[PDB]
Design a binder for these strands. Structure first.
Ligand SMILES: [Ca+2]
Length: 313
DNA sequence: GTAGACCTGG
DNA sequence: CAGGTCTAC
């Protein structure tokens, strides 16, 4: 009975396991729907379900605990090894209290604004999902992006399991996305011109860059190196590259500059371009603005930016 | 080194 | 009308 549908902490207590984690270090309601990953849904109030480490999970938290439950057979509580995967996904080793202190210490503005928005951290995402999810972010809003990514995974990703009327799918592989007629197919799913970038980048990686390995090892390369490489892919400009660097390649100093960030820079810092004579967003002015926040916040400027983006809603 | 074109739900 | 990327003078 309760053995069907998405679980909740109450309905199947013996199936959940917890990870010590204070809400000051993580607010699911601030991270999961914030445009880092687009594959988490709050199917039950305060409960988020999505694919993590190739399996489906539901997560919910109390004041000091991050409660997790996994759907693989034979119903059972998450093993310690599995829970680890959750910890790594949320990079729980990176201490938020420490980062907030540092940023608050060097930025009076961050100071005030951050008090009301604690728990905003960066998800450690898979390079492929992050690469194609953000290729779909172009001239698009979170709601539409979520739909496109969803249709995309349903059509080309492996079927995992079914909860209620939701069939979860793993993210498509490079082979799948590189397949014949993927573009036309993606266009039917509404991805528009982005359909072409998805197809083109899948093939470029597989047939020109050396495949998945080329991408995966960027995590060991330098931020400037990683950012440089990523920009080779079609549909991947400096902005989506920074997103990938920050979100999947362990480059915490990466700062994706979009119009949103410009608004923050102008309104909350009275910032203006020093180098370029261009007064608005341009390849040159965007690069600079990114440098501005890096010198202000430090080695984790990217994480700091996420905090401001949350409080800005 | 700065404009329209690219797609389409609103 | 709306998060960028791409390419033409
Ligand atoms: Ca490119």
């Amino acid at each position: 009975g309760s053995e069907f549908g998405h679980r909740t902490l109450a309905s199947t207590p013996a199936l959940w396991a917890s990870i010590p984690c204070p809400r000051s270090e993580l607010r699911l309601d601030l991270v999961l729907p914030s445009a880092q990953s687009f594959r988490w849904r709050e199917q039950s109030p305060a409960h988020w379900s999505g694919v993590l480490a190739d399996q489906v999970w539901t997560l919910t938290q109390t004041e000091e605990q991050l409660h997790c439950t996994v759907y693989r057979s034979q119903a059972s509580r998450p093993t310690p090894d599995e829970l680890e995967a959750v910890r790594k996904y949320f990079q729980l080793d990176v201490t938020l209290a420490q980062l907030y202190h540092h940023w608050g210490s060097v930025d009076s503005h961050f100071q005030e604004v951050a008090q009301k928005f604690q728990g905003v951290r960066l998800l450690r995402q898979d390079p492929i999902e992050c690469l194609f999810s953000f290729i779909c972010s172009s001239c698009n809003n979170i709601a539409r992006i979520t739909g496109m990514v969803e249709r995309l995974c349903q059509a080309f990703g492996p079927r995992l399991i079914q909860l209620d009327d939701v069939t979860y799918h793993g993210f498509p592989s490079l082979q799948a996305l590189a397949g014949p007629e993927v573009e036309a197919h993606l266009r039917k799913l509404g991805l528009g011109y982005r359909a072409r970038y998805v197809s083109a980048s899948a093939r470029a990686i597989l047939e020109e860059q050396g495949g998945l390995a080329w991408l995966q090892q960027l995590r060991e390369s330098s931020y400037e190196e990683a950012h440089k490489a990523l920009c080779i892919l079609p549909g991947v400009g400096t902005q989506v590259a920074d997103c990938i660097c920050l979100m999947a390649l362990d480059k915490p100093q990466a700062v994706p500059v979009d119009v949103h960030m410009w608004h923050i820079a102008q309104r909350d810092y009275s910032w203006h371009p020093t180098t370029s004579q261009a007064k608005g967003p341009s390849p040159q002015t965007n690069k600079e603005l990114g440098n501005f926040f890096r010198s202000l916040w430090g080695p984790y400027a990217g994480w700091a930016q996420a905090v401001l983006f949350s409080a800005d809603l």
